[PDB]
Amino acid sequence: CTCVAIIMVSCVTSVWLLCRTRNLCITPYKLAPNAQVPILLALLCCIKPTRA
């Protein structure tokens, strides 16, 4: 019971670290839709595809 609490706490901590990186993946580029996006920062590190 102590073991399964450690895995549950560490899973929701790393995935909130990754979600904060996910939110900061797109925030410097949502304010300017006219700016081009690199192909490295679209699929490998971040998730978003080319749109519009």
Binding site: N23, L24, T27, K30, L31, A32, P33, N34, A35, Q36
Partner: protein, 151 residues
């Protein structure tokens, strides 16, 4: 230009600007926009880059165009006067730089918005404005001089 202000207890303490597709609002001010269409928008909080939501429908999009790259340091338009600096903001005289003047856009000679003011009340005889802009490739940056109180 179309710039709806922000009302709180009868007085005006901020301004909300509209660019192509998206609606801007400073985080430092609290209140409701006078446009009832803009009140139903789900504006979300974010970091210093001031990300909000442009959830407006199709009938009034692209009010003005945001200024692209290749920025010269010459003349630029402003609501209370003129600014003439690219890396920084110009030392505008007094009158402008009081309280509740946040969110006012800075336009170009073709009517293209370049920057949005956020601070820099007064820094002596020379007043510097803390604005957001795009540095080289359209990536939104935030430039803040020293001693820039929220204005």
């Amino acid at each position: 230009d179309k710039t709806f202000p922000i009302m709180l207890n009868g007085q005006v303490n901020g301004y909300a600007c509209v660019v192509g597709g998206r609606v801007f609002k400073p985080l430092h001010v609290e209140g409701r926009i006078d446009n009832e269409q803009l009140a139903a928008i789900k504006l979300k909080k974010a970091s210093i880059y001031d990300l909000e939501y442009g959830d407006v429908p199709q009938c009034m999009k692209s009010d003005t165009l945001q200024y692209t790259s290749d920025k010269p340091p010459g003349f630029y338009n402003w609501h209370h006067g003129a600014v003439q600096y690219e890396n920084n903001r110009f030392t505008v005289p007094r009158g402008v730089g009081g309280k509740g003047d946040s969110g006012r856009p800075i336009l170009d000679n073709k009517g293209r918005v370049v920057a949005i003011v956020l601070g820099g009340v007064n820094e002596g005889s020379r007043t510097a404005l803390s604005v957001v802009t795009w540095n080289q490739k359209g990536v939104t940056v935030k430039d803040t001089p020293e001693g820039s109180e929220p204005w």
